[PDB]
Amino acid sequence: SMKIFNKESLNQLEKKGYLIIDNFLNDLNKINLIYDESYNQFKENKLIEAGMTDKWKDKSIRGDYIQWIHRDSSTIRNINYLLDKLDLIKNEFDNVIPNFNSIKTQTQLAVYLNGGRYIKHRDSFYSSESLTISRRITMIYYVNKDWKKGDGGELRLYTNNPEFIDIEPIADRLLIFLSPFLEHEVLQCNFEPRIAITTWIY
Ligand SMILES: O=C(O)CNC(=O)C(=O)O
Ligand code: NI
Ligand code: NI
C-alpha cells in the first residue's frame, strides 16, 4: 500500500525521528531506469562537485556530485516519476498532520564516487533567503543495485531526537527523518557510483 502514515508509523516518526520504507516502488524495470538516468546525468556533466581548492571548501566536508532538480521532451522521465511519488508523501503529510502546511519541496540528485563521504550535519538551516526554517522533512531514495555489506557508503543516523544506526543504501529503499533533529553522516564509499535522490519538504 502507498499510504505511509498509519497510527504506529506516525508515532515512530514523532518518537524515533526516522522511518524506513523498503521496496518503495518494487518495480525492478523502473529502478534500473532511475539508475541509468541518474548515472547519465553524471556522465553528461550535469552534476557539480558540492565541496568544489579553497580553504575548508574541498572534498573533506562532502565529496559527492549533485544536481538540483526543479519540479512542477525529457531525459529524466523516470526520475520525475519517483519525484511525483515522493510528492504524494508530502500530500499525505499535509492531510494527516493538520498544521504541517508544506510550503515547497527541494530535490537533490547526489552521486558519490569511490572514497566519498559527508561529515556529520543536520539538513535544516536558517538563511536570509526565507523568514522561517528550511527543510523540515528529509526523504532519501536509494538506487544502489546489488549493494553488499562491505561497500560502505552507509548513512549513519544518530538517534537523538529532541547512539546511531547504520542504514544500508540499498536500492528502492526510502528513508524519511526529521531534518531539524537527526544528525547524520555518509560513511566512506567503497563502491561507485552511490546514487541517492533526496526531496526535502519545507
Ligand atoms: O545521501 C545520503 O544518504 C545523505 N545525504 C545528506 O545527508 C545530504 O545531502 O545532506
Ligand atoms: Ni504498502
Ligand atoms: Ni543530510
Author numbering: 58 to 109, 113 to 132, 143 to 232, 245 to 284
From the paper:
In the cellular slime mold Dictyostelium discoideum, the human parasite Toxoplasma gondii and the crop pathogen Pythium ultimum, PHD-type 2OG oxygenases catalyze the hydroxylation of a prolyl residue in the S-phase kinase-associated protein (Skp1). This enables Skp1 glycosylation in a manner proposed to regulate protein degradation via effects on the SCF class of E3-ubiquitin ligase of which Skp1 is an essential subunit; however, glycosylation independent roles of Skp1 prolyl hydroxylation are also manifested.
Following construct optimization and use of thermal shift assays, which revealed that Ni(II) ions and N-oxalylglycine (a stable 2OG analog) stabilize the enzymes, we obtained crystals of DdPhyA(60-284) (space group C2221, 3 molecules per asymmetric unit, resolution 2.02 Å) from which we were able to determine a structure by molecular replacement. Consistent with all reported 2OG oxygenase structures, DdPhyA contains an eight stranded “distorted” DSBH (βI-βVIII) core-fold. Each of these disordered loops is likely involved in substrate binding, as is the case for some other 2OG oxygenases (see below). Octahedral coordination of the nickel ion (substituting for iron) is completed by a water molecule and the oxalyl group of NOG, the latter in a bidentate manner. Although there are minor differences, e.g. in the precise 2OG methylene/NOG NH positions, the geometry of the metal ion and NOG/2OG-binding elements of DdPhyA are strikingly similar to those observed in HsPHD2 and TaPHD. Notably, the C terminus of DdPhyA is much shorter than all other prolyl hydroxylases for which structures are available, i.e. it is truncated at the end of β9 (VIII, C-terminal residue: Tyr284). The results for DdPhyA, however, demonstrate that an extended prolyl hydroxylase C terminus is not necessary for efficient coupling of 2OG turnover with substrate oxidation.
